[PDB]
Symmetry: D2
Subunit: 68 residues, 4 copies
């Protein structure tokens, strides 16, 4: 009914990183081990941080991808 916690280190949001030289990002919804919305990303230096979906921060990312 209302699962909580399980296997998602991307809890809350890793917005500590800033959007700009991004390359690609994944977006998984709240699955089983992840009852919360989970979004991970990837930079130009093939590494992956993670952002949220209910914030204008990642909207600057997708918006930066629509620009082209």
């Amino acid at each position: 009914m209302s699962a909580k916690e399980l296997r998602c280190q991307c809890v809350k949001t890793t917005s500590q990183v800033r959007p700009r030289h991004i390359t690609s990002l994944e977006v998984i919804k709240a699955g089983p081990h992840c009852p919360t919305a989970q979004l991970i990303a990837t930079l130009k230096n093939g590494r992956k941080i993670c952002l949220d979906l209910q914030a204008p921060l990642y909207k600057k990312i997708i918006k930066k991808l629509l620009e082209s």
Copy 2:
């Protein structure tokens, strides 16, 4: 050829698939081998099709991920 046809496997858009029962999707911008905007996706049956970014089709996907 002035940014056109390089090594991208999903040209135009693979909208032949319908939204819902999805799991996660990739969002890559127009890189080098892919001068065009490229977006891939993933379904419940761990497979991957691909959609576009300038259309309301994938907007139904992200919107389906925000409703939660």
Copy 3:
């Protein structure tokens, strides 16, 4: 020695899952946030667990991918 617990959900090994109806699997080396060897995986039910690289468990996976 290099870094200590930064961004790795696959600590030790998630071998609780058994190999068989797999689809694809990732394998990242020990980066910065992940000084430990880290590899994730994907099943038929588009989900992702994670295994190790110094064990015969994932070798049954790659071996199952070579048989074809």
Copy 4:
């Protein structure tokens, strides 16, 4: 039991790239759209090429990931 016109993101093998400063690589078996073994990869410059599974080329990659 059916193999006709499908969509492999990488036919044959993109060995044109050399192994060395890699970051992570995908390993998907012969799915439906891809009845052939399909393996993709990722470099330090977050990009993705693709290699094979029945060759010692990618074995140098996994071997380089085990050395650690």
